[PDB]
Amino acid sequence: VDNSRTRPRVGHIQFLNCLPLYWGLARTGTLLDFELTKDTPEKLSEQLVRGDLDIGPVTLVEFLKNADDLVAFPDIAVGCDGPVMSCVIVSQVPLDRLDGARVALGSRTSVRLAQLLLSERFGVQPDYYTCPPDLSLMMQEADAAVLIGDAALRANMIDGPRYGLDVHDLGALWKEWTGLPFVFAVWAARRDYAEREPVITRKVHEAFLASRNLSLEEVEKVAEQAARWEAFDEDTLAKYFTTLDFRFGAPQLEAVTEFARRVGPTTGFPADVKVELLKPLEHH
Amino acid sequence: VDNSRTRPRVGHIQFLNCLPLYWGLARTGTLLDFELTKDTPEKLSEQLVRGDLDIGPVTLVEFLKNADDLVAFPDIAVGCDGPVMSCVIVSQVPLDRLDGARVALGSTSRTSVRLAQLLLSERFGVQPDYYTCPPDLSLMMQEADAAVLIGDAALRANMIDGPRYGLDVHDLGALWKEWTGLPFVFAVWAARRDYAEREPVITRKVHEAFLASRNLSLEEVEKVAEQAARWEAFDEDTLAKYFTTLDFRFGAPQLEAVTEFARRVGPTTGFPADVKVELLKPLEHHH
Numbered sequence: 001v002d003n004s005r006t007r008p009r010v011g012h013i014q015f016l017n018c019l020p021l022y023w024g025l026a027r028t029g030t031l032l033d034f035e036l037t038k039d040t041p042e043k044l045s046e047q048l049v050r051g052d053l054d055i056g057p058v059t060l061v062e063f064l065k066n067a068d069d070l071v072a073f074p075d076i077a078v079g080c081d082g083p084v085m086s087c088v089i090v091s092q093v094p095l096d097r098l099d100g101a102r103v104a105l106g107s108r109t110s111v112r113l114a115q116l117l118l119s120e121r122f123g124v125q126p127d128y129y130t131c132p133p134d135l136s137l138m139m140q141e142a143d144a145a146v147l148i149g150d151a152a153l154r155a156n157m158i159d160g161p162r163y164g165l166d167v168h169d170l171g172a173l174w175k176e177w178t179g180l181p182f183v184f185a186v187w188a189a190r191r192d193y194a195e196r197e198p199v200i201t202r203k204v205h206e207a208f209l210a211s212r213n214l215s216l217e218e219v220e221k222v223a224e225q226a227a228r229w230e231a232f233d234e235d236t237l238a239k240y241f242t243t244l245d246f247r248f249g250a251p252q253l254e255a256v257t258e259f260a261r262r263v264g265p266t267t268g269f270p271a272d273v274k275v276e277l278l279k280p281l282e283h284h
Numbered sequence: 285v286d287n288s289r290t291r292p293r294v295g296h297i298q299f300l301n302c303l304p305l306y307w308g309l310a311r312t313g314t315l316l317d318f319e320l321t322k323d324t325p326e327k328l329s330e331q332l333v334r335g336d337l338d339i340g341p342v343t344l345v346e347f348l349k350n351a352d353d354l355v356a357f358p359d360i361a362v363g364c365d366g367p368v369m370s371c372v373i374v375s376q377v378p379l380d381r382l383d384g385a386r387v388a389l390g391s392t393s394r395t396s397v398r399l400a401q402l403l404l405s406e407r408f409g410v411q412p413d414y415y416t417c418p419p420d421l422s423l424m425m426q427e428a429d430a431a432v433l434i435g436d437a438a439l440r441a442n443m444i445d446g447p448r449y450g451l452d453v454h455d456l457g458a459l460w461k462e463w464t465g466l467p468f469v470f471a472v473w474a475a476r477r478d479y480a481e482r483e484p485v486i487t488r489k490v491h492e493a494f495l496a497s498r499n500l501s502l503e504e505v506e507k508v509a510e511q512a513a514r515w516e517a518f519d520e521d522t523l524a525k526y527f528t529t530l531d532f533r534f535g536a537p538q539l540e541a542v543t544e545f546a547r548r549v550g551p552t553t554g555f556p557a558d559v560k561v562e563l564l565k566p567l568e569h570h571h
């Protein structure tokens with residue numbers, strides 16, 4: 001019987017927003033300490049919650065709904081301070097004409113944020129419905145659409161300009177409304193894994209920080225390589241990678257707090273839900 | 285419509301025998317040009333053959349059966365010159381007592397299983413009653429007299445379980461070496477013919493990146509084994525020895541081994557004894 005220690009099962013968002021981080025994990029060799037699963041952010045959240053991953057990214061809403069069972073990594077997240085570029089509202093009309101109009105969404109956090117903004121900032125109540133991210137399809141059936149990930153980035157930088165569609169950056173809309181940054185996803189460990197294997201959890205956290213730091217220093221190398229496989233060019237990817245904000249300190253947490261307070265009672269978690277952070281090792 | 289170019293779908297054997305290569309693909313950044321799939325060798329061969337992968341490792345037998353539709357990469361393979369350490373026969377009795385005896389064959393293997401049957405029948409002259417089952421040494425040893433394992437399971441049987449329980453472990457790479465004086469090739473890297481023709485430069489760059497990644501894996505083998513030992517029952521010395529015993533060359537001496545093995549097993553495996561192996565031709569230059 002092979003009772004040797006086993007690698008942590010670590011998830012990783014397949015979209016461009018975490019491609020530089022993947023570059024970091026590969027260049028540092030960190031990937032060989034992981035049992036990696038690449039998928040979409042909503043699937044990776046499902047897996048971690050139900051126990052198919054030990055550590056991985058969790059879209060903020062799904063983290064808040066499971067905050068008692070997850071422990072978030074400090075100093076790394078997927079967020080923005082102003083525009084986020086990859087979370088948008090695409091609209092054929094000004095936003096203030098969406099009351100009673102049809103708005104298409106996406107296959108959990110950004111959708112709630114868009115609904116928060118439209119209802120509580122602009123004061124419109126649209127007839128929402130969910131459909132797969134297809135800007136061309138959405139524009140025929142609805143007045144506006146909510147896209148995330150690469151689709152929103154494509155809508156923002158390519159499709160939007162080509163077809164003369166207003167693209168509203170949800171991160172900028174939030175900033176304008178509150179002056180705050182925004183956090184869309186965090187990294188967490190399952191509580192039970194964090195408690196059974198504290199040092200593995202700790203070193204996974206440190207390896208994510210090291211890989212994230214390397215991804216910032218070599219962002220140009222990442223964008224050059226990635227441009228060969230994307231409709232986006234190297235400049236566009238470099239701008240995207242550098243606009244993304246991967247910090248998770250005090251200003252980001254307060255943004256999480258206030259967002260939770262405004263959407264909690266209508267999303268499925270307490271407005272004052274507590275976010276437990278992986279405590280660093282004390283020394284003597 | 286996003287008509288941009290897409291990454292090749294590249295397979296990768298999940299066992300330890302290709303972990304240093306994985307270190308190479310990650311450290312070189314090559315991984316970010318692949319859409320990688322990790323699996324067992326028999327699954328990856330099925331996937332490439334049916335079209336779920338563009339490029340990937342193919343266990344030799346399955347490559348030969350599909351030689352018209354696959355183009356093998358030169359100068360990289362999974363092989364040995366002597367012992368391979370991770371392709372073995374585990375037996376409670378001497379091999380010449382296996383005639384009519386029960387022998388289990390691990391499901392994930394196609395080449396090593398055929399090689400073992402070749403050796404037992406044509407070298408030792410025994411005809412055992414084989415059956416296929418998933419790789420579980422503890423289970424195999426209770427129901428059968430001998431077992432054929434590959435990958436990490438065979439590596440564990442050879443280095444750990446065998447000595448602990450006093451089981452004879454026969455290295456299939458050495459048995460072949462003794463019999464023929466030749467090295468052996470268990471798996472090659474190939475591109476689908478249709479993918480190689482539609483995307484010649486991508487195919488070439490994937491090949492070149494595999495060579496560079498393999499070369500880095502040899503130079504930093506100790507770093508790979510040190511890191512890998514933390515997650516395995518094997519220690520760093522054992523893994524380092526394993527990685528350096530594995531032979532990743534695929535030149536002229538390795539091909540003759542492929543040729544001769546094909547000739548001896550072809551008419552009993554499902555391909556002509558003189559099946560042609562098409563290799564990715566290098567680009568000529570003229571300055």
Ligand SMILES: C=C(Oc1cccc(C(=O)O)c1)C(=O)O
Nearest residue numbers: 041059086108109110148149184
């Ligand atoms: C940068 C992004 O921000 C995210 C990432 C993951 C999930 C969500 C969500 O809203 O659930 C948002 C992006 O999607 O590219």
Ligand SMILES: C=C(Oc1cccc(C(=O)O)c1)C(=O)O
Nearest residue numbers: 343370393394395396434435470
């Ligand atoms: C070095 C090995 O040789 C192999 C590799 C891949 C497939 C097979 C097979 O038997 O099909 C054998 C190993 O398994 O570690």
